[PDB]
PDB file of C-alpha atoms in Angstrom:
ATOM      1  CA  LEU A   1       6.115  18.265  -8.807  1.00  0.00           C
ATOM      2  CA  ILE A   2       9.099  20.840  -9.511  1.00  0.00           C
ATOM      3  CA  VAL A   3      11.724  20.614 -12.280  1.00  0.00           C
ATOM      4  CA  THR A   4      14.586  19.743  -9.696  1.00  0.00           C
ATOM      5  CA  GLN A   5      12.647  16.400  -8.842  1.00  0.00           C
ATOM      6  CA  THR A   6      12.958  15.311 -12.374  1.00  0.00           C
ATOM      7  CA  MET A   7      15.783  13.769 -14.210  1.00  0.00           C
ATOM      8  CA  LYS A   8      18.660  16.411 -15.374  1.00  0.00           C
ATOM      9  CA  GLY A   9      20.119  15.261 -18.773  1.00  0.00           C
ATOM     10  CA  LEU A  10      17.900  12.488 -19.800  1.00  0.00           C
ATOM     11  CA  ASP A  11      18.440  10.671 -23.240  1.00  0.00           C
ATOM     12  CA  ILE A  12      15.008   9.270 -24.018  1.00  0.00           C
ATOM     13  CA  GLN A  13      16.683   6.693 -26.720  1.00  0.00           C
ATOM     14  CA  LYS A  14      18.462   4.757 -23.975  1.00  0.00           C
ATOM     15  CA  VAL A  15      15.330   3.644 -21.834  1.00  0.00           C
ATOM     16  CA  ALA A  16      14.088   1.668 -24.991  1.00  0.00           C
ATOM     17  CA  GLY A  17      12.894  -2.067 -24.328  1.00  0.00           C
ATOM     18  CA  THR A  18      11.718  -4.459 -21.871  1.00  0.00           C
ATOM     19  CA  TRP A  19      10.877  -3.385 -18.359  1.00  0.00           C
ATOM     20  CA  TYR A  20       9.080  -4.653 -15.119  1.00  0.00           C
ATOM     21  CA  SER A  21       7.115  -2.882 -12.890  1.00  0.00           C
ATOM     22  CA  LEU A  22       8.631  -3.707  -9.400  1.00  0.00           C
ATOM     23  CA  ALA A  23       6.818  -1.210  -6.924  1.00  0.00           C
ATOM     24  CA  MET A  24       4.132   1.319  -6.922  1.00  0.00           C
ATOM     25  CA  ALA A  25       2.887   4.329  -4.784  1.00  0.00           C
ATOM     26  CA  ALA A  26       0.070   6.914  -4.932  1.00  0.00           C
ATOM     27  CA  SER A  27      -0.841   9.995  -2.945  1.00  0.00           C
ATOM     28  CA  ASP A  28      -4.421   8.670  -2.615  1.00  0.00           C
ATOM     29  CA  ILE A  29      -5.549   4.899  -2.126  1.00  0.00           C
ATOM     30  CA  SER A  30      -8.340   5.273  -4.516  1.00  0.00           C
ATOM     31  CA  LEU A  31      -5.720   5.837  -7.278  1.00  0.00           C
ATOM     32  CA  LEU A  32      -4.689   2.009  -7.039  1.00  0.00           C
ATOM     33  CA  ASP A  33      -7.352   0.556  -5.054  1.00  0.00           C
ATOM     34  CA  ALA A  34      -9.693  -1.214  -7.733  1.00  0.00           C
ATOM     35  CA  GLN A  35      -7.631  -3.792  -9.848  1.00  0.00           C
ATOM     36  CA  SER A  36      -9.468  -1.588 -12.724  1.00  0.00           C
ATOM     37  CA  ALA A  37      -8.023   1.722 -11.451  1.00  0.00           C
ATOM     38  CA  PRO A  38      -7.018   3.693 -14.567  1.00  0.00           C
ATOM     39  CA  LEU A  39      -3.633   4.640 -13.072  1.00  0.00           C
ATOM     40  CA  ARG A  40      -2.807   0.669 -11.704  1.00  0.00           C
ATOM     41  CA  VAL A  41      -0.937  -0.328 -14.866  1.00  0.00           C
ATOM     42  CA  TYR A  42       2.250  -2.548 -15.269  1.00  0.00           C
ATOM     43  CA  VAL A  43       4.721  -1.379 -17.759  1.00  0.00           C
ATOM     44  CA  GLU A  44       6.239  -4.082 -20.105  1.00  0.00           C
ATOM     45  CA  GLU A  45       8.032  -2.158 -22.777  1.00  0.00           C
ATOM     46  CA  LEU A  46       9.071   1.641 -23.519  1.00  0.00           C
ATOM     47  CA  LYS A  47       9.552   2.744 -27.249  1.00  0.00           C
ATOM     48  CA  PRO A  48      10.887   6.189 -28.027  1.00  0.00           C
ATOM     49  CA  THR A  49      10.112   7.156 -31.342  1.00  0.00           C
ATOM     50  CA  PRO A  50      12.533   9.082 -33.958  1.00  0.00           C
ATOM     51  CA  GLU A  51      10.754  12.191 -33.231  1.00  0.00           C
ATOM     52  CA  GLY A  52      11.543  12.075 -29.528  1.00  0.00           C
ATOM     53  CA  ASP A  53       8.120  10.851 -28.105  1.00  0.00           C
ATOM     54  CA  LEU A  54       7.796   7.989 -25.678  1.00  0.00           C
ATOM     55  CA  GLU A  55       5.511   4.927 -26.586  1.00  0.00           C
ATOM     56  CA  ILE A  56       4.437   3.015 -23.698  1.00  0.00           C
ATOM     57  CA  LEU A  57       3.048  -0.598 -23.839  1.00  0.00           C
ATOM     58  CA  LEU A  58       1.484  -1.427 -20.691  1.00  0.00           C
ATOM     59  CA  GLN A  59      -0.973  -4.456 -19.074  1.00  0.00           C
ATOM     60  CA  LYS A  60      -3.688  -3.877 -17.154  1.00  0.00           C
ATOM     61  CA  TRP A  61      -6.504  -6.209 -15.364  1.00  0.00           C
ATOM     62  CA  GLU A  62      -9.851  -6.482 -17.095  1.00  0.00           C
ATOM     63  CA  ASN A  63     -12.610  -8.701 -15.939  1.00  0.00           C
ATOM     64  CA  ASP A  64     -10.421 -11.806 -15.105  1.00  0.00           C
ATOM     65  CA  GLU A  65      -7.973 -11.322 -18.011  1.00  0.00           C
ATOM     66  CA  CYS A  66      -4.559  -9.113 -18.878  1.00  0.00           C
ATOM     67  CA  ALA A  67      -5.491  -6.497 -21.623  1.00  0.00           C
ATOM     68  CA  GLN A  68      -2.485  -4.915 -23.317  1.00  0.00           C
ATOM     69  CA  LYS A  69      -2.888  -0.838 -23.878  1.00  0.00           C
ATOM     70  CA  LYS A  70      -0.352   1.493 -25.980  1.00  0.00           C
ATOM     71  CA  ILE A  71      -0.231   4.779 -24.973  1.00  0.00           C
ATOM     72  CA  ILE A  72       1.796   8.033 -26.594  1.00  0.00           C
ATOM     73  CA  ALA A  73       3.656  10.296 -23.923  1.00  0.00           C
ATOM     74  CA  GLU A  74       4.550  13.259 -26.322  1.00  0.00           C
ATOM     75  CA  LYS A  75       7.852  15.489 -25.631  1.00  0.00           C
ATOM     76  CA  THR A  76       7.202  18.719 -24.183  1.00  0.00           C
ATOM     77  CA  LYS A  77       9.387  21.952 -23.656  1.00  0.00           C
ATOM     78  CA  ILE A  78      10.516  20.347 -20.317  1.00  0.00           C
ATOM     79  CA  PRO A  79      13.041  17.713 -20.685  1.00  0.00           C
ATOM     80  CA  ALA A  80      12.053  14.378 -18.853  1.00  0.00           C
ATOM     81  CA  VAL A  81       8.291  15.586 -18.786  1.00  0.00           C
ATOM     82  CA  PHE A  82       5.891  13.980 -21.443  1.00  0.00           C
ATOM     83  CA  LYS A  83       2.160  14.660 -22.003  1.00  0.00           C
ATOM     84  CA  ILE A  84      -0.388  12.005 -22.516  1.00  0.00           C
ATOM     85  CA  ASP A  85      -2.536  14.376 -24.745  1.00  0.00           C
ATOM     86  CA  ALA A  86      -5.960  12.167 -24.161  1.00  0.00           C
ATOM     87  CA  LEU A  87      -9.301  13.480 -23.369  1.00  0.00           C
ATOM     88  CA  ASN A  88      -7.960  13.338 -19.640  1.00  0.00           C
ATOM     89  CA  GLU A  89      -4.651  14.750 -19.367  1.00  0.00           C
ATOM     90  CA  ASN A  90      -1.895  13.004 -17.610  1.00  0.00           C
ATOM     91  CA  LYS A  91       1.996  13.995 -17.304  1.00  0.00           C
ATOM     92  CA  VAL A  92       4.668  11.439 -17.182  1.00  0.00           C
ATOM     93  CA  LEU A  93       7.568  12.507 -15.207  1.00  0.00           C
ATOM     94  CA  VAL A  94      11.034  10.490 -15.222  1.00  0.00           C
ATOM     95  CA  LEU A  95      12.446  11.303 -11.884  1.00  0.00           C
ATOM     96  CA  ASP A  96      15.772   9.035 -12.431  1.00  0.00           C
ATOM     97  CA  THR A  97      17.263   6.288 -14.299  1.00  0.00           C
ATOM     98  CA  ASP A  98      20.576   4.523 -15.029  1.00  0.00           C
ATOM     99  CA  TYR A  99      19.364   3.119 -18.284  1.00  0.00           C
ATOM    100  CA  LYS A 100      20.748  -0.387 -17.545  1.00  0.00           C
ATOM    101  CA  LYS A 101      18.934  -1.238 -14.254  1.00  0.00           C
ATOM    102  CA  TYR A 102      16.371   1.072 -12.975  1.00  0.00           C
ATOM    103  CA  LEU A 103      13.801   3.879 -13.886  1.00  0.00           C
ATOM    104  CA  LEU A 104      11.356   5.554 -11.759  1.00  0.00           C
ATOM    105  CA  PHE A 105       8.641   7.708 -12.856  1.00  0.00           C
ATOM    106  CA  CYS A 106       5.325   9.320 -11.863  1.00  0.00           C
ATOM    107  CA  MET A 107       1.931   9.920 -13.568  1.00  0.00           C
ATOM    108  CA  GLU A 108       0.240  13.200 -12.491  1.00  0.00           C
ATOM    109  CA  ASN A 109      -3.523  13.629 -12.953  1.00  0.00           C
ATOM    110  CA  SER A 110      -3.006  17.413 -14.009  1.00  0.00           C
ATOM    111  CA  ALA A 111      -6.597  18.698 -13.925  1.00  0.00           C
ATOM    112  CA  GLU A 112      -7.450  17.815 -10.373  1.00  0.00           C
ATOM    113  CA  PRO A 113      -7.425  20.253  -7.514  1.00  0.00           C
ATOM    114  CA  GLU A 114      -5.931  17.452  -4.974  1.00  0.00           C
ATOM    115  CA  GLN A 115      -2.228  16.601  -5.700  1.00  0.00           C
ATOM    116  CA  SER A 116      -2.751  13.239  -7.636  1.00  0.00           C
ATOM    117  CA  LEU A 117       0.179  11.282  -8.143  1.00  0.00           C
ATOM    118  CA  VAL A 118       0.867   7.753  -9.024  1.00  0.00           C
ATOM    119  CA  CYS A 119       4.751   6.561  -9.214  1.00  0.00           C
ATOM    120  CA  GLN A 120       6.540   3.500 -10.150  1.00  0.00           C
ATOM    121  CA  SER A 121      10.022   1.735  -9.896  1.00  0.00           C
ATOM    122  CA  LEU A 122      10.857  -0.358 -13.095  1.00  0.00           C
ATOM    123  CA  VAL A 123      13.466  -2.796 -13.403  1.00  0.00           C
ATOM    124  CA  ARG A 124      15.071  -4.265 -16.727  1.00  0.00           C
ATOM    125  CA  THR A 125      15.178  -7.829 -15.298  1.00  0.00           C
ATOM    126  CA  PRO A 126      13.707  -9.725 -12.404  1.00  0.00           C
ATOM    127  CA  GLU A 127      17.021 -10.068 -10.784  1.00  0.00           C
ATOM    128  CA  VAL A 128      17.841 -10.075  -7.085  1.00  0.00           C
ATOM    129  CA  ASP A 129      19.104  -6.598  -6.301  1.00  0.00           C
ATOM    130  CA  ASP A 130      17.261  -3.980  -4.271  1.00  0.00           C
ATOM    131  CA  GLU A 131      18.997  -0.673  -5.818  1.00  0.00           C
ATOM    132  CA  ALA A 132      15.629   0.098  -7.789  1.00  0.00           C
ATOM    133  CA  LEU A 133      13.683  -0.183  -4.581  1.00  0.00           C
ATOM    134  CA  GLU A 134      16.283   2.029  -2.270  1.00  0.00           C
ATOM    135  CA  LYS A 135      16.198   4.715  -4.909  1.00  0.00           C
ATOM    136  CA  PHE A 136      12.511   4.729  -5.087  1.00  0.00           C
ATOM    137  CA  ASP A 137      11.768   4.995  -1.420  1.00  0.00           C
ATOM    138  CA  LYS A 138      14.502   7.846  -1.339  1.00  0.00           C
ATOM    139  CA  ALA A 139      12.650   9.631  -4.308  1.00  0.00           C
ATOM    140  CA  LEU A 140       9.013   9.235  -2.237  1.00  0.00           C
ATOM    141  CA  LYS A 141      10.469  10.574   1.005  1.00  0.00           C
ATOM    142  CA  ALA A 142       9.543  14.100  -0.472  1.00  0.00           C
ATOM    143  CA  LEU A 143       6.063  13.320  -1.342  1.00  0.00           C
ATOM    144  CA  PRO A 144       2.944  12.454   0.622  1.00  0.00           C
ATOM    145  CA  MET A 145       2.314   9.003  -0.414  1.00  0.00           C
ATOM    146  CA  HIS A 146      -0.695   7.196   1.190  1.00  0.00           C
ATOM    147  CA  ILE A 147      -0.340   3.704  -0.446  1.00  0.00           C
ATOM    148  CA  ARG A 148       2.725   1.741  -1.131  1.00  0.00           C
ATOM    149  CA  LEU A 149       2.969  -1.719  -3.070  1.00  0.00           C
ATOM    150  CA  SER A 150       5.873  -4.237  -4.049  1.00  0.00           C
ATOM    151  CA  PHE A 151       5.492  -7.257  -6.231  1.00  0.00           C
ATOM    152  CA  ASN A 152       6.263 -10.706  -4.980  1.00  0.00           C
ATOM    153  CA  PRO A 153       7.998 -13.487  -6.791  1.00  0.00           C
ATOM    154  CA  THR A 154       5.245 -15.171  -9.064  1.00  0.00           C
ATOM    155  CA  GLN A 155       5.689 -13.671 -11.695  1.00  0.00           C
ATOM    156  CA  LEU A 156       6.492 -11.107 -10.197  1.00  0.00           C
ATOM    157  CA  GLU A 157       3.801  -9.667 -11.810  1.00  0.00           C
ATOM    158  CA  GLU A 158       4.556  -7.766 -15.045  1.00  0.00           C
TER     159      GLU A 158
ATOM    160  CA  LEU B   1       5.738 -13.952  14.970  1.00  0.00           C
ATOM    161  CA  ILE B   2       7.745 -14.419  18.294  1.00  0.00           C
ATOM    162  CA  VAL B   3       6.973 -13.748  21.963  1.00  0.00           C
ATOM    163  CA  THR B   4       9.287 -10.940  22.304  1.00  0.00           C
ATOM    164  CA  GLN B   5       7.664  -9.099  19.398  1.00  0.00           C
ATOM    165  CA  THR B   6       4.408  -8.873  21.338  1.00  0.00           C
ATOM    166  CA  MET B   7       3.477  -6.570  24.175  1.00  0.00           C
ATOM    167  CA  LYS B   8       4.921  -7.725  27.655  1.00  0.00           C
ATOM    168  CA  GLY B   9       2.379  -6.866  30.429  1.00  0.00           C
ATOM    169  CA  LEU B  10      -0.654  -6.182  28.822  1.00  0.00           C
ATOM    170  CA  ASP B  11      -3.797  -4.949  30.812  1.00  0.00           C
ATOM    171  CA  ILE B  12      -6.525  -6.115  28.475  1.00  0.00           C
ATOM    172  CA  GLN B  13      -9.184  -4.165  30.426  1.00  0.00           C
ATOM    173  CA  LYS B  14      -7.432  -0.762  29.721  1.00  0.00           C
ATOM    174  CA  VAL B  15      -7.908  -1.022  25.882  1.00  0.00           C
ATOM    175  CA  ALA B  16     -11.761  -0.835  26.110  1.00  0.00           C
ATOM    176  CA  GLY B  17     -13.542   1.628  24.346  1.00  0.00           C
ATOM    177  CA  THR B  18     -13.423   3.589  20.914  1.00  0.00           C
ATOM    178  CA  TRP B  19     -10.776   3.391  18.319  1.00  0.00           C
ATOM    179  CA  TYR B  20     -10.032   4.364  14.859  1.00  0.00           C
ATOM    180  CA  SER B  21      -7.891   2.418  12.217  1.00  0.00           C
ATOM    181  CA  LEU B  22      -5.175   4.789  11.089  1.00  0.00           C
ATOM    182  CA  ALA B  23      -2.831   2.607   8.850  1.00  0.00           C
ATOM    183  CA  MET B  24      -2.766  -0.976   7.828  1.00  0.00           C
ATOM    184  CA  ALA B  25      -0.079  -3.299   6.351  1.00  0.00           C
ATOM    185  CA  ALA B  26       0.135  -6.994   4.889  1.00  0.00           C
ATOM    186  CA  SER B  27       2.719  -9.549   4.049  1.00  0.00           C
ATOM    187  CA  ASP B  28       0.763  -9.768   0.537  1.00  0.00           C
ATOM    188  CA  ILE B  29      -0.918  -7.453  -1.592  1.00  0.00           C
ATOM    189  CA  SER B  30      -3.967  -9.753  -2.144  1.00  0.00           C
ATOM    190  CA  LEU B  31      -4.696  -9.669   1.767  1.00  0.00           C
ATOM    191  CA  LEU B  32      -5.921  -6.242   1.635  1.00  0.00           C
ATOM    192  CA  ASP B  33      -6.562  -5.688  -2.265  1.00  0.00           C
ATOM    193  CA  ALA B  34     -10.522  -6.337  -2.804  1.00  0.00           C
ATOM    194  CA  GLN B  35     -12.440  -3.799  -0.579  1.00  0.00           C
ATOM    195  CA  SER B  36     -14.237  -7.227   0.384  1.00  0.00           C
ATOM    196  CA  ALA B  37     -10.848  -8.600   1.622  1.00  0.00           C
ATOM    197  CA  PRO B  38     -11.625 -10.692   4.630  1.00  0.00           C
ATOM    198  CA  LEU B  39      -8.644  -8.897   6.815  1.00  0.00           C
ATOM    199  CA  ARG B  40      -9.403  -5.416   5.239  1.00  0.00           C
ATOM    200  CA  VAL B  41     -11.861  -4.342   8.408  1.00  0.00           C
ATOM    201  CA  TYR B  42     -11.637  -0.948  10.153  1.00  0.00           C
ATOM    202  CA  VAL B  43     -11.872  -1.090  13.873  1.00  0.00           C
ATOM    203  CA  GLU B  44     -14.530   1.017  15.747  1.00  0.00           C
ATOM    204  CA  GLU B  45     -14.477  -0.329  19.378  1.00  0.00           C
ATOM    205  CA  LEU B  46     -12.687  -2.907  21.619  1.00  0.00           C
ATOM    206  CA  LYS B  47     -14.985  -4.763  24.333  1.00  0.00           C
ATOM    207  CA  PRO B  48     -12.902  -6.899  26.626  1.00  0.00           C
ATOM    208  CA  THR B  49     -15.248  -9.096  28.775  1.00  0.00           C
ATOM    209  CA  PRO B  50     -14.870  -9.745  32.617  1.00  0.00           C
ATOM    210  CA  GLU B  51     -13.667 -13.143  31.792  1.00  0.00           C
ATOM    211  CA  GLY B  52     -10.468 -11.896  29.824  1.00  0.00           C
ATOM    212  CA  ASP B  53     -11.511 -12.236  26.310  1.00  0.00           C
ATOM    213  CA  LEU B  54     -11.503  -9.370  23.806  1.00  0.00           C
ATOM    214  CA  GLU B  55     -14.548  -8.669  21.730  1.00  0.00           C
ATOM    215  CA  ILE B  56     -13.818  -6.439  18.607  1.00  0.00           C
ATOM    216  CA  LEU B  57     -16.586  -4.252  16.550  1.00  0.00           C
ATOM    217  CA  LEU B  58     -15.276  -3.776  13.102  1.00  0.00           C
ATOM    218  CA  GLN B  59     -16.812  -2.031  10.182  1.00  0.00           C
ATOM    219  CA  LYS B  60     -16.408  -3.704   6.522  1.00  0.00           C
ATOM    220  CA  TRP B  61     -17.264  -2.646   2.855  1.00  0.00           C
ATOM    221  CA  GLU B  62     -20.144  -4.885   1.292  1.00  0.00           C
ATOM    222  CA  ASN B  63     -21.705  -4.008  -2.034  1.00  0.00           C
ATOM    223  CA  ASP B  64     -21.636  -0.324  -1.538  1.00  0.00           C
ATOM    224  CA  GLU B  65     -22.733  -0.274   2.364  1.00  0.00           C
ATOM    225  CA  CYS B  66     -20.720  -0.112   5.440  1.00  0.00           C
ATOM    226  CA  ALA B  67     -21.567  -3.419   7.347  1.00  0.00           C
ATOM    227  CA  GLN B  68     -20.705  -3.763  11.030  1.00  0.00           C
ATOM    228  CA  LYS B  69     -19.499  -7.271  12.565  1.00  0.00           C
ATOM    229  CA  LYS B  70     -18.629  -8.251  16.099  1.00  0.00           C
ATOM    230  CA  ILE B  71     -16.046 -10.913  16.478  1.00  0.00           C
ATOM    231  CA  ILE B  72     -14.735 -12.791  19.910  1.00  0.00           C
ATOM    232  CA  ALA B  73     -11.231 -12.944  20.283  1.00  0.00           C
ATOM    233  CA  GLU B  74     -10.558 -15.502  23.207  1.00  0.00           C
ATOM    234  CA  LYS B  75      -7.618 -15.287  25.671  1.00  0.00           C
ATOM    235  CA  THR B  76      -4.959 -18.041  25.299  1.00  0.00           C
ATOM    236  CA  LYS B  77      -1.992 -19.377  27.466  1.00  0.00           C
ATOM    237  CA  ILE B  78       0.328 -16.616  25.959  1.00  0.00           C
ATOM    238  CA  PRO B  79      -0.268 -12.893  27.340  1.00  0.00           C
ATOM    239  CA  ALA B  80      -1.228 -10.466  24.547  1.00  0.00           C
ATOM    240  CA  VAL B  81      -2.341 -13.132  21.990  1.00  0.00           C
ATOM    241  CA  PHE B  82      -5.825 -14.080  21.153  1.00  0.00           C
ATOM    242  CA  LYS B  83      -7.753 -16.523  19.091  1.00  0.00           C
ATOM    243  CA  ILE B  84     -10.478 -16.105  16.875  1.00  0.00           C
ATOM    244  CA  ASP B  85     -11.915 -19.747  17.071  1.00  0.00           C
ATOM    245  CA  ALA B  86     -13.833 -19.400  13.901  1.00  0.00           C
ATOM    246  CA  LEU B  87     -13.986 -22.111  11.240  1.00  0.00           C
ATOM    247  CA  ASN B  88     -10.754 -20.088   9.761  1.00  0.00           C
ATOM    248  CA  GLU B  89      -8.337 -19.860  12.638  1.00  0.00           C
ATOM    249  CA  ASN B  90      -7.160 -16.277  12.859  1.00  0.00           C
ATOM    250  CA  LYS B  91      -4.768 -14.992  15.883  1.00  0.00           C
ATOM    251  CA  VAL B  92      -4.777 -11.283  17.013  1.00  0.00           C
ATOM    252  CA  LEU B  93      -1.592 -10.511  18.610  1.00  0.00           C
ATOM    253  CA  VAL B  94      -1.049  -7.061  20.542  1.00  0.00           C
ATOM    254  CA  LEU B  95       2.335  -5.607  19.694  1.00  0.00           C
ATOM    255  CA  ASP B  96       2.378  -2.316  21.852  1.00  0.00           C
ATOM    256  CA  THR B  97      -0.144   0.214  23.262  1.00  0.00           C
ATOM    257  CA  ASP B  98       0.068   2.874  25.815  1.00  0.00           C
ATOM    258  CA  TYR B  99      -3.671   2.581  26.334  1.00  0.00           C
ATOM    259  CA  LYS B 100      -4.629   6.418  25.959  1.00  0.00           C
ATOM    260  CA  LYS B 101      -3.515   7.220  22.512  1.00  0.00           C
ATOM    261  CA  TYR B 102      -2.395   4.087  20.095  1.00  0.00           C
ATOM    262  CA  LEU B 103      -2.539   0.494  19.855  1.00  0.00           C
ATOM    263  CA  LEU B 104      -0.674  -1.843  17.361  1.00  0.00           C
ATOM    264  CA  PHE B 105      -1.672  -5.020  16.597  1.00  0.00           C
ATOM    265  CA  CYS B 106      -1.684  -7.773  13.789  1.00  0.00           C
ATOM    266  CA  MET B 107      -3.953 -10.412  12.396  1.00  0.00           C
ATOM    267  CA  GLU B 108      -2.495 -13.898  11.113  1.00  0.00           C
ATOM    268  CA  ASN B 109      -3.745 -16.754   9.098  1.00  0.00           C
ATOM    269  CA  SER B 110      -2.477 -19.418  11.075  1.00  0.00           C
ATOM    270  CA  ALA B 111      -3.320 -22.323   9.068  1.00  0.00           C
ATOM    271  CA  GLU B 112      -1.476 -20.987   5.587  1.00  0.00           C
ATOM    272  CA  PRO B 113       1.892 -22.164   4.814  1.00  0.00           C
ATOM    273  CA  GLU B 114       3.102 -18.610   3.605  1.00  0.00           C
ATOM    274  CA  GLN B 115       3.497 -15.913   6.447  1.00  0.00           C
ATOM    275  CA  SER B 116       0.295 -14.180   6.076  1.00  0.00           C
ATOM    276  CA  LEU B 117      -0.088 -11.324   8.340  1.00  0.00           C
ATOM    277  CA  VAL B 118      -2.268  -8.080   8.248  1.00  0.00           C
ATOM    278  CA  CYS B 119      -1.368  -5.343  10.888  1.00  0.00           C
ATOM    279  CA  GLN B 120      -2.934  -2.019  12.063  1.00  0.00           C
ATOM    280  CA  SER B 121      -2.159   1.165  13.877  1.00  0.00           C
ATOM    281  CA  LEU B 122      -5.129   2.348  15.896  1.00  0.00           C
ATOM    282  CA  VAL B 123      -5.830   5.943  17.489  1.00  0.00           C
ATOM    283  CA  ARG B 124      -8.084   6.907  20.089  1.00  0.00           C
ATOM    284  CA  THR B 125      -9.200  10.075  18.432  1.00  0.00           C
ATOM    285  CA  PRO B 126      -8.451  11.835  15.104  1.00  0.00           C
ATOM    286  CA  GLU B 127      -6.025  14.108  16.324  1.00  0.00           C
ATOM    287  CA  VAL B 128      -3.071  15.389  14.552  1.00  0.00           C
ATOM    288  CA  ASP B 129       0.028  13.523  16.290  1.00  0.00           C
ATOM    289  CA  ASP B 130       2.170  11.035  14.465  1.00  0.00           C
ATOM    290  CA  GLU B 131       3.472   8.814  17.309  1.00  0.00           C
ATOM    291  CA  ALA B 132       0.937   6.124  16.167  1.00  0.00           C
ATOM    292  CA  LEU B 133       2.424   6.192  12.919  1.00  0.00           C
ATOM    293  CA  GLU B 134       6.101   6.211  13.789  1.00  0.00           C
ATOM    294  CA  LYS B 135       5.676   3.499  16.313  1.00  0.00           C
ATOM    295  CA  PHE B 136       3.832   1.346  13.656  1.00  0.00           C
ATOM    296  CA  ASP B 137       6.340   2.023  11.019  1.00  0.00           C
ATOM    297  CA  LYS B 138       9.448   0.882  13.551  1.00  0.00           C
ATOM    298  CA  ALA B 139       7.083  -2.270  14.534  1.00  0.00           C
ATOM    299  CA  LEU B 140       7.017  -3.228  10.740  1.00  0.00           C
ATOM    300  CA  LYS B 141      10.783  -2.759   9.827  1.00  0.00           C
ATOM    301  CA  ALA B 142      11.260  -6.495  11.409  1.00  0.00           C
ATOM    302  CA  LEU B 143       8.547  -7.680   9.079  1.00  0.00           C
ATOM    303  CA  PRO B 144       8.370  -8.570   5.378  1.00  0.00           C
ATOM    304  CA  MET B 145       5.287  -6.141   4.312  1.00  0.00           C
ATOM    305  CA  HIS B 146       4.569  -5.761   0.728  1.00  0.00           C
ATOM    306  CA  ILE B 147       1.560  -3.232   1.010  1.00  0.00           C
ATOM    307  CA  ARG B 148       1.198  -0.124   3.298  1.00  0.00           C
ATOM    308  CA  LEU B 149      -1.846   2.030   3.553  1.00  0.00           C
ATOM    309  CA  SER B 150      -2.644   5.253   5.566  1.00  0.00           C
ATOM    310  CA  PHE B 151      -6.183   6.825   5.761  1.00  0.00           C
ATOM    311  CA  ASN B 152      -6.609  10.401   4.841  1.00  0.00           C
ATOM    312  CA  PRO B 153      -8.713  13.105   6.524  1.00  0.00           C
ATOM    313  CA  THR B 154     -12.417  12.321   5.469  1.00  0.00           C
ATOM    314  CA  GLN B 155     -13.587  10.954   7.448  1.00  0.00           C
ATOM    315  CA  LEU B 156     -10.598   9.703   8.131  1.00  0.00           C
ATOM    316  CA  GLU B 157     -12.258   6.524   7.376  1.00  0.00           C
ATOM    317  CA  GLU B 158     -13.091   4.424  10.371  1.00  0.00           C
TER     318      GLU B 158
END
């Protein structure tokens, strides 16, 4: 992605707290196909640190169960861009937020030659309001996505 | 679905021959999630019979392999609507076609209480042309779809 496509003026401390994954999209079907896909994850909480890094609590499917994982996305020299400095590098890019209702982000598989992107729309509460989803679809118009998912009522899911 | 949403004036004999599944959508994620999902199938050929029924040759994933299946969708009293009169009833509804390039259809799980729909865009050849996909997205605007997939170049897939 380019710098204009990410959020200008992000305050990471204001994204703290509970979130729900409302919709996901990816450039490649296989990125979100297997319930166990590495980048098929549901956000449950964001925990920015005093040092300006972003800790992410996620749920994932595993055998039948719902496993929690905690990953650390570290600040970089570019605002709104964070690096999970794991063995497999992934960048997390915050596209937009209003802090109080919605947050749009992508995970990119930096090493791969193909463009390899998974993006989500997060909401603070399960309320009926489609601003999160309108803003996400507008943001994805610029990107080649081949799969698009939205989470139904029960419960809705995470 | 309603009668206006399906094709007026369909000639079944003109849909005969080779097709490729270019995109799929469903009202529920779980309808197309597992590669083995019953309604996750790729069309390879349509074979209308002299009696006015529609035979469908499909490919599906199975363990690792690509299995062929042949199913019979029988004519009904409603034009463009066909019934697979299997133990589990499914209707096949032709939404639109120009016979020479594209064909839009849905499979409905009639028995279920929830609306349960899987729809596809089929093309005659893998040519670069997006009319199939524009027509499919226009047709799906009227329907509550929660998952949307499109098949990439290799090869592209069936």
